[PDB]
């Protein structure tokens, strides 16, 4: 979207998140991931690999 984003007056910077990368032999269990609605499906956990 924007490689250099200026913190807007309407935005507070909570932090910067490093990319979580899964190797060819790796999986992670994402606690509380969104569905397609963009809303946090808490409690759930989605295993992501590959």
């Amino acid at each position: 979207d924007t490689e250099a984003h200026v913190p807007d007056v309407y935005e507070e910077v909570l932090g910067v998140v490093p990319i979580t990368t899964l190797g060819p032999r790796h999986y992670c269990v994402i606690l509380d991931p969104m569905g397609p609605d963009g809303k946090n499906q808490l409690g759930q956990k989605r295993v992501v690999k590959g």
């Binding site: 609605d37 963009g38 809303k39 946090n40 808490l42």
Partner: protein
Amino acid sequence: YLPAVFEEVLDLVDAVILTEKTALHLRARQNFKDLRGVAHRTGEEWLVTVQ
């Protein structure tokens, strides 16, 4: 908003933050009709969400 001759200005109330993760649980202090057009009694507690 330029205050009138009678309006004593109180604190600036900001809109609460409502994402689908959260819902605002509030109690009506008295009979009125909300912005959505729903009659509420003098203490009925309901939820306002992103919907």
